[PDB]
């Protein structure tokens, strides 16, 4: 419903200033692997929530905004240190855009192969980002649910939406698996699932990096399966 194919990707629209960017890469045992992202336009400004899989499909991501909003990207925020995630890191810096991460992500970044952000973002204990350390943010709202996923995964809310972005740590309602847990907190996945609820209580439209956008039952879902990892 609603698909706009461009290129390899497909972008829909999910809301009046927000659209999901979809890029795909092939795995063993395994087939195509769907990745989703955010873009989000701000006033007279483009903000973009993760990058693709590759530097050219996320300069293909670029090359829509040009063709569908036609404003600038004034800043990216990648949610953690994975290739679905980080994969285009080189495009952002080549087209001059602004990125932040997680001080986590940025930390491991380097050896899991990825480049760095030029950016940290760093979180009080209520895992609220410190609002100095993400200037021009808008309408984002960047919250740190603890360990799951990964150890540095990090959720954004978009102000004046109903929508909140779980990334690789909320699954779908009738997803079958947590997907790839290599890098999981098995422990605190579940607390940190249901912490993100907490964060975004209003939000009735979860996005997520590996499934369509569903109910707030993909995080009650989401935390039940991962209430089996402790
Ligand atoms: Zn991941
Ligand atoms: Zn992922």
């Known amino acids: 419903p609603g698909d706009q194919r461009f290129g390899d990707l497909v972008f829909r629209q999910l809301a009046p200033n927000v659209w999901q960017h979809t890029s795909y890469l092939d795995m063993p045992g395994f087939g195509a692997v769907a990745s989703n992202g955010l873009i989000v336009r701000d006033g007279g400004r483009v903000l973009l929530v993760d990058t693709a899989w590759t530097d050219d499909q996320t300069a293909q991501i670029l090359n829509w905004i040009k063709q569908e909003i036609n404003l600038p990207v004034a800043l990216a925020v990648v949610t953690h240190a994975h290739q679905d995630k980080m994969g285009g890191m080189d495009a952002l810096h080549a087209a001059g855009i602004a990125t932040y991460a997680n001080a986590l992500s940025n930390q491991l970044a380097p050896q899991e192969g990825l480049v760095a952000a030029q950016h940290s973002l760093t979180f009080a204990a209520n895992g609220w980002v410190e609002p100095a350390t993400a200037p021009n943010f808008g309408p984002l709202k960047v919250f740190y649910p603890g360990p799951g996923h990964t150890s540095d995964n990090i959720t954004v809310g ?11 740590l909320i699954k779908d309602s009738k997803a079958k698996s947590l997907g790839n ?18 964060a975004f209580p209003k939000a009735s439209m979860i996005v997520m990096s590996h499934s369509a956008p569903d109910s707030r039952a993909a995080i009650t879902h989401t935390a039940r399966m991962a209430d089996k990892l402790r």
């Open 158 to 168: 978009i102000d004046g939406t109903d929508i909140a972005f779980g990334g690789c």
């Open 181 to 198: 847990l290599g890098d999981a907190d098995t422990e605190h996945y579940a607390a940190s699932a249901r912490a993100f609820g907490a």
